[PDB]
Each structure stands twice: as C-alpha cells, then as structure tokens.
Design a protein around this nucleic acid. Sequence first.
DNA 1: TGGAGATGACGTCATCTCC
DNA 2: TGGAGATGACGTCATCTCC
Lengths: 55, 55
Amino acid sequence: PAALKRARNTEAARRSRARKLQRMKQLEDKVEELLSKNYHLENEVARLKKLVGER
Amino acid sequence: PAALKRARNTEAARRSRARKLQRMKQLEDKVEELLSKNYHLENEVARLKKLVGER
DNA sequence: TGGAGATGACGTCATCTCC
DNA sequence: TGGAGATGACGTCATCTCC
C-alpha cells in the first residue's frame, strides 16, 4: 500500500538531509583552512622576496 | 485568521530557501578559488626557493 | 512589550539515475 | 526491464531574535 512507499521515502529523506548538513559543514571548514594556508604562503613569498639575490 | 499567518510564512520560507542555495554556491566557488591561488603561491615559493642566495 | 520575520526539521510529492 | 533510492522544492509547525 501507499503507506510503505511513504514510510521508506521519509527515511531516505532524513538520511539525505543529514548528508547535506555534513556537506555544508565541510565547505565552511575548508574555506577557513585554505584561508590560513594562504596567509602563511603570502608571508613566505614576502620573506623570500626581500632576500633573493642576497638582499 | 490562521490563513494569513500561514501565507506570510510560506513566503518567508521561500526567500529563506533561496538565500541558502546562494550560500552553498558561494562556498563551492570560493573553495575552488583559494585552491588555485594556492597552486600559484606554492609554485612561486618553489621558484624563489631554488634561487635565494643566488642559486 | 509584543509583535513580525527568519530558520531548523519534518513529511510529502514528482523526478532522476541506476543494476 | 522495472524497480528502488536519492533529491529538489514545497508547505508547515515551533522556536529564536529583534525594535
């Protein structure tokens, strides 16, 4: 009966919502990570720049 | 009547969903941007590294 | 104040994409 | 194949957070 097609999907719907919230969270975390790897890489270049050649 | 509290919220609900999809999209785009700024900054350091001092 | 609007999380339906 | 499961987008309800 209808009942069971609905039951089985309410749950496929619940798992699905949970994956989406773990996707959003990873992105939020990675933007943040790449933003800090960048500050250090842009300092590194500044440092080596004021130095290459020998001064 | 109830009717109108529901009407007004169905719409606050529609705007809200649209903001969320523009949030997800910006993150997707920025992870990507910071990943390419990084490849170039890690090449830059490699280049200047094999050079500082003079060789 | 209390009153409005924004948002989580639900359940549903219609559509896709697979073995 | 067709049959199951994953997903968009809806509408709703209960809760928050503000001026």
